[PDB]
Amino acid sequence: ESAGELLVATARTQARGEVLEEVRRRVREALEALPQKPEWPEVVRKLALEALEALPGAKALVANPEDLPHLEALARERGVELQAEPALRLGVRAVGAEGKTQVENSLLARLDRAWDALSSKVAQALW
Template structure:
């Protein structure tokens, strides 16, 4: 082999070595770039999954809080409904008690005082005996109406005033229930 061939062979080998090194460097760079991209994608996906998990946990906590608040509200409503039922039950039992004639007379006096020129008092038929003497003394007519419960209706021409315990409870219920709720739950 001649010197020229040797030099050319060496140059070709050097070029091949350089190209091989260049190719290996490019391959390493591509592998590193692919690994970096894969790592970045993996980290991004991990962050996304963590965010989704956190959102899911937050939604579940919110749903649980809403469910709990709804259950509390429903339970409070049931307690207040039971309290009202008990109050109505006690009011309905008043006519059987000894104090009923006095309570009825006071209701009648309040209604008469609220309606100037009162002419007539209307009560439940069972309550007539309790107000006969009182109505006579006041110079008022006395009539029976089964529709009047736990109270009286006073008439003056076209005007009337009804003073009955269940209606009073109805009118006062918002305040009563608010005070009861405050006493029970603060």
């Protein structure tokens, strides 16, 4: 009977899922390729600025040592401290004044937080 149309439906859904996962893979590759290019310091500075703005008061600013020279300008100007850490790349992380809150602005996390909403737009664009 027409119950065999389930095969067509599941095939279509599985193909769409594979396409979306490939799009995500390419996005992750592009993200990890950003720091190598010269345009990375400004985006990281903006990320750190937003992270600080999210804290009513930040005790310190945390980023990988390769970013510390680029973030020193904001760190000293904003008056907050700073410390090196093998933290997540592609962004900067903030620590609350009391030391019990923490805001992270990594792009590898922003992608995870934005994929659920962006999936509909990406699917519309693809098809």
